[PDB]
Design a protein around this ligand. Structure first.
Ligand SMILES: CN(C)CCc1cccc(C2CCN(CCc3cnn(-c4nccc5c(=O)[nH]cnc45)c3)CC2)c1
Ligand SMILES: [Zn+2]
Ligand SMILES: [Zn+2]
Length: 335
């Protein structure tokens, strides 16, 4: 049951792939959740949209210029909101000489170039664009309507991310320690780093040691999604982690309390949203939030799935310690 907590890759058939929540339960029974990140390669015959040639006049309302400050594997990213631009304007800029991906042999070479140049030539990230690239009829893994227990509740809505070389997402867990689904619609790859949920507190303690002013101001400062930490720093301080490259037409699943970060190799488009399973309810209850934020009332969840614990929890007498290695109750039919 994944004792090494390494990122697992799944290749479901069309029949396996049809039920989203059932397949999430299956990958959990195989211990995929232990790494905090997993890859799901869909069947070759599956496509969420016939063509991506009609999106040139799609508006990115808040492009963000990403300014990075730091040294020795420790960085802070500052976002500068720019005025609205089209995918056409973004793609041209992305592919221009100033912002294009450098020439490289292996990923290790591109990764080294990223960590060496992330403070130079700030890129533009077409992030958090409300919308979907999923066609209407597509019933399998539709990020716009996954129909998880999360529907009981801008947390169940899809977001589009138009990336360019060196655009980054900082170290973070999902808001409310939820799950997330990320599908790379098209383009250049997206490379990820993950810290297993069982070592999430080790990363937080390391981050608190390096940014003590940021931690004294906010309890969960990593939730601001500004802190970038290189694989070499993680290695230097014995933080266990793994890395994976997501290619066009592949899904990435993030698990409750699974810390992740990464960067885009070049012009690309990803679709994302949050989702839940019965396992998340305890993570939602115990989630340490940003003081200075996305907040969900957990009462409705405890009232339906834990009616016996509702009174105890409403009082403060529910002090259940989470086991990060345990799979979702739904994973019963696969064990
Ligand atoms: C509103 C504010 C934004 N939030 C979304 C926050 C969130 C959470 N995770 N996350 C990311 N995780 C993984 C991958 C990526 C990525 O490739 N790119 C950007 N962001 C990523 C982003 C929605 C409400
Ligand atoms: Zn995320
Ligand atoms: Zn805060």
């Amino acid at each position: 049951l994944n004792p090494s907590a390494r990122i697992m890759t799944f290749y479901p058939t069309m029949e396996e792939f049809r039920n989203f929540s059932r397949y999430i339960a299956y990958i959990e029974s195989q211990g995929a959740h232990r790494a905090g990140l997993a890859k799901v390669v869909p069947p070759k015959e599956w496509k969420p949209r016939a063509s991506y040639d009609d999106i040139d006049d799609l508006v990115i309302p808040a492009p963000i210029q990403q300014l990075v400050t730091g040294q020795s594997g420790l960085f802070t990213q500052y976002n500068i909101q720019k005025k609205a631009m089209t995918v056409r304007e973004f793609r041209k800029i992305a592919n221009s000489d100033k912002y294009c991906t450098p020439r490289y042999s292996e990923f290790e070479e591109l990764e080294r170039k990223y960590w060496k140049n992330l403070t130079f030539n700030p890129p533009i990230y077409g992030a958090d664009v409300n919308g979907t690239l999923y066609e209407k009829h597509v019933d399998e893994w539709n990020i716009g309507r996954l129909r998880t227990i999360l529907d009981l509740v801008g947390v169940n809505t899809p977001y589009l991310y138009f990336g360019m070389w060196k655009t980054s997402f900082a170290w973070h867990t999902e808001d409310m320690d939820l799950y997330s689904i990320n599908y790379l619609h098209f383009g250049e790859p997206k490379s990820w780093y993950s810290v297993p949920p069982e070592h999430g507190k080790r990363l937080e303690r390391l981050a608190k040691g390096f940014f003590p002013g940021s931690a004294q101001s906010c309890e969960a400062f990593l939730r601001h999604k500004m802190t970038l930490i290189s694989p070499l720093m993680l290695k230097k301080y014995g933080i266990p982690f793994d890395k994976v490259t997501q290619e066009a037409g592949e899904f990435m699943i993030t698990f409750p309390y699974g810390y992740h970060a990464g960067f885009n190799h070049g012009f690309n488009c990803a679709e994302s949203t949050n989702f839940a399973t019965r396992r998340w309810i305890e993570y939602g209850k115990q989630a340490v939030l940003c003081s200075c934020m996305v907040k969900i009332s957990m009462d409705v969840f405890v009232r339906k799935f834990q009616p016996e614990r509702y009174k105890l929890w409403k009082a403060g007498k529910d002090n259940t310690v989470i086991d990060h290695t345990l799979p979702t109750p739904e994973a019963a039919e696969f064990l």
